[PDB]
């Protein structure tokens, strides 16, 4: 297994459990969106949270389908919001009247614009619910942009071996299926990286000065090994290997030393002796 | 005399163009109706 | 004192009101009426003193009958019904009573112009809404929009209507919003089917054939549909005989006697049994007597002829509506 | 011995103590602190964080420097690591 | 004490790939054929150090068929130590 | 004696001469070339003294080093 240039992947294995349930939260909402307004009750299956280079998202991308980008303040770059063809047909078919039972195969005709309509309609929709998901972890200011017919054109990332994050979902409404993903660039998230892996926490207040004030109290004794380092000198393996006792091994001058646990200098101190004992005349702690 | 003809027809213009708009100053949509009906017979 | 058509009588009245007038005047106005009335002045002539008195005039014998000192509909009903009812049902009732003014005006409309023009507007919506748009407009114009898509999506149309489920008002009246939209598109179509038949129609007999055989060789289906479109002169030959008949009756004799000299001798045959028995044998003495005729003159006849045919089928008469069909 | 000539950082170990957070905040200026070591004692000799031998700090003609005493006495190890 | 006095100095900087820890006796046994592993998970950032000082985290990317690195982050005092341990 | 004792090594892929003002005007998303080839074998450095050479090869999902040429000391001086 060789090493190139082109897996430029900050490979993920942990859970994301933040996101799980920020998606689950977020599908909760839309359902009862659509709900509201299809007049039907649909069901939102959420699929596993996949993590792929955008050239391989692209590839699975069934083409031909709907794509919209969006801009996420304070977040640099922009989102990819796509709706596949089997979706809004089932909308724009409850929306107007039907059953579904005499579905149409899509021809690369381009969208009619009463179609666009309701794509915008659902789109505003699907919005303002990732944005409520969003705000209980972080507050996120989503906006669409633009809409595109093909994936190419939409230059969501600089290189196509770029990775991304792309969340599927699964919307069925009595027999009629269709699916939607929201794919997003895997810099959109990586200063977050570390808010998304721990799940999100309700507490803000209590734990605030709580935890503040109990750690204190707690961890004020609890013993910690240290180590003074009195001297420091170099040497080679031919005279360690020749090492036997009876030599000297030249010292400069120690005028400080240093405490550290575990290699992390913790103070310095000047050596000494007292009451019998290798005793440290401290001076200050690294700060 | 043909003066005198286009002087008072000028007049009496003036003067019905003070009626219509003070007219119209009460109710536009009786103007808005009467263009509608005239729309309406030109047609026909 | 030139005949004024009420456009005229209405710029009269427009540019004498005065300009807050004519805007509030505007304000009481559907869009196309003040897109026609903003037509007039473009191009209209200057009034003159019986003509602007006559038309005022009149403005005062139809106020006589308009007078009753109304204020704008829209806002003193919203101004009561806020405190008749409260402001929530006031908008939701002036939405409704909006919503289905709008349906209403937008299905009068289209139940108003010629089929094919909606059907290739409604060619490329999407079968559902095409479904909808049908059904809740005119049977007769219902049909006819019907008759003129393609077998599969007339079909599938049908088995969305025989399989209905109800459909919403509101999103209903957004979709004739958005269809009156698209026919305020500024575009002139000139089909290079219909028009080129009649160009090549026009032609003389030598560049029509060259035009002829030229498309035929680029694509013969075409040439084809345009010859089937325009049909020559020599199709009198398919003609039903009730209508050469008809044509004979306004036709002139020594016209015909002309242009009988390079017509086919079949199509004279059929033509000649056509009119009576003495103006047939005339007409047959006449060509035996008399003696060759220049070709331009007896093109310009058999076009002279093409041209009364097409002018009396614009009123009906005639029946050539592509070929004589099928026999019962 | 392909592997003859490699550098290797060695260090000294005076003596720890158990000693707490808060024991070691309250230390300022001046303030003493002491290690397990006795005075005198040897210090211990280790390299990168394994120890190797001990030594104590010798005084010749002002310069300072280490003079060893042990060897790595694997059985001796075993007994220092047991603890 | 000056700031930018120093204008032009050339200086040495480098990229590590991970570091790891055993002892000779692991390396003894290393010869052709013979693997080795490291603590770096792949991917992190490679670690850009001047004059084997440490610098900057960023990966790296091949520019003209030629090893290039895309410095990210500077080195801030907590994570100095992390490293030193 | 020395059976057992960690130590510390690294594998280094670029060895760039180039002074201050190149780093100065360093900033977020800069990218800086560096001598070594794409594919040259990594040379492989213990506490700051070359010991091997030998390109990098992924195992396990982990960072791994392929070794293939090993001191020789005559290749020393010309680096």
């Known amino acids: 297994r060789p090493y190139d240039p082109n897996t430029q992947r900050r490979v993920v294995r942990e859970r994301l459990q933040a996101l799980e349930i920020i998606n689950e939260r977020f599908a909760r909402q839309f359902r009862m969106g659509l709900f509201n307004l299809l007049r039907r009750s649909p069901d939102i299956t959420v699929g596993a949270i996949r993590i792929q280079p955008y050239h391989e998202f692209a590839r699975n991308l069934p083409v031909p389908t709907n794509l919209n980008l969006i801009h996420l303040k304070p977040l640099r770059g922009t989102g990819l919001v796509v709706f596949s063809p089997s979706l809004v047909f089932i909308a724009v078919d409850n929306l107007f009247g039907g059953d579904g039972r005499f579905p149409t195969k899509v021809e690369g005709r381009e969208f009619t614009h009463t179609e666009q309509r309701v794509i915008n309609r659902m789109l505003k929709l699907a919005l303002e619910g990732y944005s409520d998901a969003w705000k209980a972890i972080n507050p996120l200011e989503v906006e669409y942009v633009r809409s595109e017919m093909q994936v190419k054109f939409t230059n969501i990332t600089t290189s196509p071996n770029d990775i991304v994050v792309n969340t599927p979902f699964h919307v069925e409404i009595g027999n009629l299926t269709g699916e939607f993903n929201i794919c997003l660039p895997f810099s959109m998230i990586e200063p977050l990286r570390e808010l998304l892996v721990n799940p999100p926490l309700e507490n803000s207040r209590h734990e605030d000065q709580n935890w503040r004030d109990n750690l204190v109290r707690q961890v004020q004794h609890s013993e910690l090994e240290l180590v003074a380092n009195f001297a420091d000198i170099p040497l080679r393996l031919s005279q360690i290997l020749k090492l036997k006792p009876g030599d000297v091994l030249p010292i400069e001058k120690p005028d400080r030393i240093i405490a550290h646990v575990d290699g992390v200098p913790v103070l310095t101190s000047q050596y000494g002796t007292v009451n019998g004992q290798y005793a440290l005349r401290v001076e200050h702690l690294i700060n | 005399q043909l003066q005198q003809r286009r002087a008072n027809q000028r007049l009496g213009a003036e003067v019905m163009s003070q009626r219509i708009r003070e007219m119209s100053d009460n109710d536009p949509?009786?103007?808005?109706?009467?263009?509608?009906?005239?729309?309406?017979?030109?047609?026909? | 004192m030139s005949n004024l058509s009420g456009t005229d009588k209405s710029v009269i009245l427009l540019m004498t009101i005065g300009e807050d007038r004519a805007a509030e005047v505007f304000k009481?106005?559907?869009?196309?009426?003040?897109?026609?009335?903003?037509?007039?002045?473009?191009?209209?002539?200057?009034?003159?003193?019986?003509?602007?008195?006559?038309?005022?005039?009149?403005?005062?014998?139809?106020?006589?009958?308009?007078?009753?000192?109304?204020?704008?509909?829209?806002?003193?009903?919203?101004?009561?019904?806020?405190?008749?009812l409260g402001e929530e049902r006031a908008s939701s009732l002036l939405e409704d009573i909006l919503e289905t003014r709008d349906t209403t005006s937008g299905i009068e409309t289209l139940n108003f112009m010629e089929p094919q023009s909606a059907a290739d507007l409604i060619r490329d919506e999407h079968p559902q809404i095409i479904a909808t748009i049908l059904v809740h407009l005119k049977r007769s114009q219902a049909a006819d929009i019907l008759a003129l898509f393609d077998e599969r999506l007339r079909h599938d149309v049908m088995l969305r209507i025989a399989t209905f489920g109800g459909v919403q008002l509101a999103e209903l009246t957004e979709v004739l919003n958005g269809l009156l939209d698209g026919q305020n598109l500024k575009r002139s179509k000139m089909?290079?089917?219909?028009?080129?038949?009649?160009?090549?129609?026009?032609?003389?007999?030598?560049?029509?054939?060259?035009?002829?055989?030229?498309?035929?060789?680029?694509?013969?289906?075409?040439?084809?549909?345009?010859?089937?479109?325009?049909?020559?002169?020599?199709?009198?030959?398919?003609?039903?005989?009730?209508?050469?008949?008809?044509?004979?009756?306004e036709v002139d004799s020594e016209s015909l006697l002309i242009a009988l000299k390079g017509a086919e001798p079949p199509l004279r045959e059929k033509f000649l049994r056509n009119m009576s028995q003495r103006a047939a044998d005339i007409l047959r003495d006449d060509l035996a007597n008399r003696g060759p005729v220049r070709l331009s003159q007896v093109e310009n006849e058999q076009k002279a002829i093409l041209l009364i045919v097409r002018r009396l089928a614009e009123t009906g008469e005639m029946v050539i509506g592509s070929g004589e069909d099928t026999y019962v | 011995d392909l592997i003859m000539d490699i550098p290797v950082k060695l260090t000294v170990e005076l003596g720890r103590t158990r000693m707490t957070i808060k024991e070691l905040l309250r230390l300022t200026q001046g303030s003493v602190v002491a290690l397990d070591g006795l005075a005198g004692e040897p210090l211990d000799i280790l390299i990168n964080g394994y120890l190797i031998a001990q030594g104590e700090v010798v005084v010749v003609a002002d310069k300072y420097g280490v003079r060893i005493t042990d060897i790595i006495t694997p059985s001796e190890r075993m007994r220092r690591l047991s603890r």
Not at chain 3, 199 to 209: A, H
Not at chain 3, 228 to 245: A, P
């Open chain 2, 29 to 44: 949509r009786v103007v808005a109706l009467v263009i509608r009906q005239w729309m309406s017979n030109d047609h026909e």
């Open chain 3, 28 to 84: 009481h106005l559907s869009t196309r009426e003040v897109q026609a009335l903003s037509t007039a002045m473009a191009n209209v002539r200057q009034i003159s003193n019986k003509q602007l008195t006559d038309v005022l005039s009149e403005f005062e014998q139809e106020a006589e009958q308009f007078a009753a000192l109304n204020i704008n509909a829209n806002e003193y009903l919203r101004s009561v019904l806020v405190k008749a």
């Open chain 3, 191 to 249: 089909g290079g089917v219909r028009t080129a038949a009649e160009i090549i129609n026009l032609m003389k007999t030598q560049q029509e054939e060259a035009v002829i055989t030229a498309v035929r060789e680029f694509d013969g289906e075409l040439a084809q549909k345009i010859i089937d479109e325009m049909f020559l002169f020599e199709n009198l030959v398919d003609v039903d005989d009730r209508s050469i008949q008809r044509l004979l009756q």
